[PDB]
Design a protein around this motif. Structure first.
Motif, PDB file in Angstrom:
ATOM      1  N   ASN A  99       0.814  -1.204   0.000  1.00  0.00           N
ATOM      2  CA  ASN A  99       0.000   0.000   0.000  1.00  0.00           C
ATOM      3  C   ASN A  99       0.849   1.255   0.000  1.00  0.00           C
ATOM      4  OD1 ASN A  99      -2.168  -1.860   1.967  1.00  0.00           O
ATOM      5  ND2 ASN A  99      -2.668  -1.040  -0.053  1.00  0.00           N
ATOM      6  N   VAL A 100       2.003   1.227   0.655  1.00  0.00           N
ATOM      7  CA  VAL A 100       2.932   2.344   0.535  1.00  0.00           C
ATOM      8  C   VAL A 100       3.284   2.565  -0.916  1.00  0.00           C
ATOM      9  CG1 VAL A 100       5.040   3.349   1.337  1.00  0.00           C
ATOM     10  CG2 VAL A 100       3.850   1.778   2.750  1.00  0.00           C
ATOM     11  N   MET A 101       3.883   1.555  -1.541  1.00  0.00           N
ATOM     12  CA  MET A 101       4.334   1.795  -2.905  1.00  0.00           C
ATOM     13  C   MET A 101       3.152   2.112  -3.809  1.00  0.00           C
ATOM     14  SD  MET A 101       7.509  -0.156  -4.889  1.00  0.00           S
ATOM     15  CE  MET A 101       7.907   0.220  -6.601  1.00  0.00           C
ATOM     16  N   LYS A 102       1.963   1.636  -3.464  1.00  0.00           N
ATOM     17  CA  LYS A 102       0.787   2.048  -4.206  1.00  0.00           C
ATOM     18  C   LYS A 102       0.583   3.543  -4.081  1.00  0.00           C
ATOM     19  CE  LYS A 102      -4.113   1.166  -4.712  1.00  0.00           C
ATOM     20  NZ  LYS A 102      -5.253   0.375  -4.200  1.00  0.00           N
ATOM     21  N   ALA A 103       0.332   4.014  -2.862  1.00  0.00           N
ATOM     22  CA  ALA A 103       0.110   5.439  -2.660  1.00  0.00           C
ATOM     23  C   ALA A 103       1.186   6.240  -3.349  1.00  0.00           C
ATOM     24  CB  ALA A 103       0.080   5.775  -1.171  1.00  0.00           C
ATOM     25  N   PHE A 104       2.386   5.689  -3.401  1.00  0.00           N
ATOM     26  CA  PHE A 104       3.409   6.267  -4.244  1.00  0.00           C
ATOM     27  C   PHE A 104       2.950   6.295  -5.685  1.00  0.00           C
ATOM     28  CE2 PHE A 104       7.695   7.578  -3.797  1.00  0.00           C
ATOM     29  CZ  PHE A 104       8.114   7.650  -5.085  1.00  0.00           C
TER      30      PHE A 104
ATOM     31  N   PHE B  37       8.747   3.997   3.409  1.00  0.00           N
ATOM     32  CA  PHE B  37       7.861   3.683   4.520  1.00  0.00           C
ATOM     33  C   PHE B  37       8.160   4.527   5.736  1.00  0.00           C
ATOM     34  CE2 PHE B  37       6.549   1.183   8.104  1.00  0.00           C
ATOM     35  CZ  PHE B  37       5.291   0.804   7.714  1.00  0.00           C
ATOM     36  N   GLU B  38       9.384   5.012   5.826  1.00  0.00           N
ATOM     37  CA  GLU B  38       9.852   5.897   6.872  1.00  0.00           C
ATOM     38  C   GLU B  38       8.876   6.988   7.255  1.00  0.00           C
ATOM     39  OE1 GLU B  38      12.499   5.603   8.500  1.00  0.00           O
ATOM     40  OE2 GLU B  38      12.916   3.750   7.427  1.00  0.00           O
ATOM     41  N   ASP B  39       8.528   7.860   6.321  1.00  0.00           N
ATOM     42  CA  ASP B  39       7.854   9.100   6.671  1.00  0.00           C
ATOM     43  C   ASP B  39       6.511   9.248   6.017  1.00  0.00           C
ATOM     44  OD1 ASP B  39       8.966   9.104   4.319  1.00  0.00           O
ATOM     45  OD2 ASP B  39       9.755  11.160   4.382  1.00  0.00           O
TER      46      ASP B  39
END
Lengths: 542, 173, 114
Positions: C9-14, C109-111
């Motif tokens: 989901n992170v890389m998605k929102a990216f 994913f850090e921030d």
């Protein structure tokens, strides 16, 4: 039934005191195939996990001499000094310089640590799904610095055949560090071959008992065939136990989705079938009774009374036999171990349920005894093991032997298990025996017994007559004696040193007795008592 | 022929044991050393020595030097011998491991006095095409016949007429 | 698998920004089982007390590149997990694709909130 000969063996490397960079394995492979002495790898070899039509190697970490990775939590290692002394052979062997010897003893430890801190403590060693890693010398050569050159230690080989480095954790590795190995290795070899040495050092360790047992794990089928085709009418006990087990396994199946909780419809149908297609084996192999053909199995084993050479030879066989098995084709009637050890086994690698004639016997069994028993004995152990093929280990391997995560239900399963976990974790034997570690076999404690009861119930109801209290004592019930017998199997006065050095028995009895409230009732005793708990009555995982 | 001269010993009658190796000269030097050692008591002590072991103990399978091998002094996977060949009759070089595991006229004269010796050459493809007889355009020499010299293909043997075939030998002990 | 879901989901929102709407659903499993390797060789805690042990020194094991540069005759770099800092060496031109795959998703994913 002194040292010189095996000295040449030792002097096949060079020794401790005072070199081009040797393939430590080649040394190993030799030492394995020649003594069956696992170091830098325990490597058992058989049916593949997840493409089975074949066989394979399971090159893996050792299994440490000091029982348990206890190379982390207390400094309770005097093997330091069970070492110096047990290595003082030399200045009695061929020498006359201790400081070396000591420091090197400390060292053959300090490596040992540097191992255990890299194996996998059993907790992680559940999901074989991640053990399985098929590699062939191509890929290791790409992975590391010698494997090929090793494998000659073990008859045109199948080097290419799928090998598995179960634990791709090899910590990757100089004078004062290289030969520390050869020390350790030799430490070990001699450390458990002091017997052939001069009568002196054997000290640091019944006649027939010890002896025949050595055999009993070395030329397995021999003593077996002797036993079976010697002392009883095969047909008889075999034909009984057939239907007996069958009863158990059956009602155990009856403990199915219909019975069970954490399961589900198709997960059921499958695991059910896993049973359905699952195998028996009793006493003899399918072979063993034109009566030579066994003496074909154990054929090669030269005989010459024309003992040092003897033992060494016999081990040479036990394993050499294990591996001539490699290159032929995979069966599913594998007889793991010598049919005289009093225990079943169930090798979920393939799928099998072999039970030994050597158990078709006392308290575990007899022909004309009350059936409460012949379910608490042979009966119990039958189930006691059979469970495995539904543990969080059994789930892994399918009906036929493969990896498909047979069953979601899991979450249910693990959670339920956590009951068992705490259970063992809050009831101490000695003065404990932390539960989280032994989970698995603990669960089978329940499962098997649960079944074997439910069966005995069923059987006896089919007649409704056996009850017939016992002559030596009216007092007891046709039912109670069941539990009595089961919890009599484990009657075992574990002396206390041995207790602190499966689970510890007294636990197994007390606990797994709790959780079958059926008991708590059928033993007449009021509830609210420290054998039976309230509403969270039972970690009903079967 | 040295076989007819001394029948006691059975070292001469041998071949190689290295499918894909470049230490042919080294293996031949070890075989020639065992033949020269047989002259001592006329074959009374006809025993084999680490050939492959000493060879590794050029770059193993990348060149050779018979002379060096002779100065170094000072069967296919056989259990009899303490040390044996490492090439299960596209390969790797082996390391050290000393652990017993369980003037044509003057040339022929020295070959008749001492015995067989190594014989360096260009080693062309033409030699491989040869089968038997007086072949022409590394290995060790055995004897002489009628004029040509013997070497050991043609069941081990491979005689040639007398590319630096008789060019490259010396001695030592 | 929660870690999984969140990673993808992170890389998605990216994937909002474009300056291939599925392959992420593989890169995910890649970096996950990468976690698993790191951990399954790293050292759990309690055993982090033998300061006696975790001290073995190394100065100037194989597969290394200066990499100290990327931080800025040095002393003996000390390596507290012969086990671990080996286990990298067994875990190494294709490699770059799934290995850098990880360091991104991590760094990202850090921030998240930013």
């Amino acid at each position: 039934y002194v040292n010189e000969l095996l000295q040449y063996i030792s002097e096949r490397f060079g020794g401790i005191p005072f070199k081009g960079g040797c393939e430590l394995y080649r040394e190993m492979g030799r030492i394995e195939q020649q003594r069956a002495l696992p170091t830098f790898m325990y490597t058992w070899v058989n049916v593949d996990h997840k493409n089975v039509s074949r066989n394979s190697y399971y090159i893996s970490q050792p299994t440490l001499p000091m029982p348990r990775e206890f190379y982390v939590l207390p400094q309770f290692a005097p093997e330091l000094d069970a070492r110096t002394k047990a290595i003082e052979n030399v200045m009695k062997a061929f020498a006359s310089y201790d400081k070396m010897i000591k420091t090197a003893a400390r060292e053959v430890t300090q490596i040992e640590q540097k191992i255990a801190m890299a194996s996998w403590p059993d907790d992680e060693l559940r999901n074989h799904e991640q053990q399985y890693n098929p590699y062939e010398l191509f890929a290791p050569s790409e992975g590391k610095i010698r494997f090929g050159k090793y494998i000659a230690g073990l008859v045109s080989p199948v080097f290419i055949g799928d090998v598995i480095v179960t634990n791709p954790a090899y910590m990757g590795f100089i004078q004062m560090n290289q030969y520390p190995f050869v020390n350790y290795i030799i430490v070990h070899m001699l450390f458990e071959d002091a017997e052939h040495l001069g009568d002196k050092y054997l000290r640091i360790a019944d006649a027939r008992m010890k002896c025949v047992d050595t055999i009993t794990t070395y030329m397995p089928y021999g003593t077996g065939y002797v036993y079976v085709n010697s002392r009883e009418d095969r047909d008889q006990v075999v034909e009984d136990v057939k239907q007996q087990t069958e009863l158990i396994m059956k009602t155990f199946l009856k403990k199915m989705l219909s019975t069970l909780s954490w399961m589900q419809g198709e997960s059921y149908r499958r695991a059910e079938k896993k049973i359905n297609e699952m195998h028996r084996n009793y006493g003899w192999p399918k072979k063993l009774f034109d009566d030579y053909y066994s003496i074909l199995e154990a054929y090669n084993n030269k005989t010459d009374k024309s003992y040092t050479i003897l033992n060494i030879l016999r081990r040479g066989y036990e394993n050499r036999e294990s591996f001539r098995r490699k290159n032929e084709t995979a069966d599913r009637t594998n007889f793991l171990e010598s049919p005289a050890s009093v225990n079943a086994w169930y090798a979920p690698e393939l799928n099998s349920l072999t039970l030994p004639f050597g158990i078709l016997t006392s308290p575990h069994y007899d022909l004309q005894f009350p059936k409460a028993f012949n379910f608490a004995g042979s009966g119990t152990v039958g189930g006691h093991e059979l469970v495995h093929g539904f543990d969080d280990e059994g789930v892994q391997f399918d009906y036929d032997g493969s990896l498909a995560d047979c069953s979601k239900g899991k979450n249910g399963f693990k959670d339920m298990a956590q009951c068992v976990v705490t259970q063992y974790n809050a009831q101490c034997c000695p003065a404990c025996a932390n539960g989280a570690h032994t989970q698995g076999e603990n669960i089978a404690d329940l499962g098997g017994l649960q079944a074997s009861y439910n069966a005995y119930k069923e059987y006896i109801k089919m007649k409704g007559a056996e009850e017939m209290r016992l002559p030596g004592l009216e007092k007891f019930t046709p039912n109670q004696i069941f539990w009595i017998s089961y919890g009599y199997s484990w009657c075992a006065k574990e002396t206390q040193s041995s207790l602190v050095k499966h689970s510890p028995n007294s636990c197994r009895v007390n606990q797994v007795l709790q959780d079958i409230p059926s008991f708590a009732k059928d033993f007449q005793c009021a509830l609210g008592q420290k054998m039976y708990p309230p509403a969270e009555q039972r970690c009903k995982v079967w | 022929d040295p076989r007819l001269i001394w029948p006691n010993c059975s070292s001469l009658f041998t071949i190689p044991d290295q499918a894909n190796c470049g230490s042919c000269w080294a293996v031949s030097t070890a075989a020639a050393i065992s033949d020269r050692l047989c002259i001592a008591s006329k074959g009374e002590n006809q025993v084999f020595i680490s050939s492959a072991d000493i060879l590794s103990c050029g770059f193993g399978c990348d060149g050779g030097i018979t002379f060096r091998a002779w100065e170094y002094f000072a069967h296919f996977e056989a259990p009899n011998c303490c040390r044996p060949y490492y090439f299960h009759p596209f390969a790797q070089t082996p390391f050290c491991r000393r652990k017993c595991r369980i003037s044509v006229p003057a040339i022929q004269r020295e070959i008749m006095t001492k015995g067989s010796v190594v014989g360096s050459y260009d080693v062309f493809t033409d030699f491989s095409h040869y089968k038997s007889g007086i072949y022409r355009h590394a290995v060790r020499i055995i004897g002489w016949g009628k004029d040509y010299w013997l070497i050991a293909g043609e069941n081990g043997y491979f005689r040639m007429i007398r590319c630096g075939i008789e060019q490259d030998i010396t001695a030592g002990d | 698998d929660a870690r999984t879901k969140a990673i993808e989901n992170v890389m998605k929102a990216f994937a909002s920004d474009i300056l291939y709407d599925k392959m992420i659903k593989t890169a995910a499993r890649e970096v996950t089982q990468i976690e698993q390797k790191i951990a399954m060789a790293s050292w759990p805690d309690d055993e982090l007390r033998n300061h006696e042990q975790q001290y073995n020194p190394y100065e100037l094991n194989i597969r290394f590149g200066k990499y100290i540069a990327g931080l800025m005759f040095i002393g003996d770099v000390i390596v507290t997990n012969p086990a671990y800092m080996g286990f990298l060496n067994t875990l190494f031109q294709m490699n770059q694709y799934p290995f850098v795959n990880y360091i991104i998703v991590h760094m990202l994913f850090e921030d998240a909130e930013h």
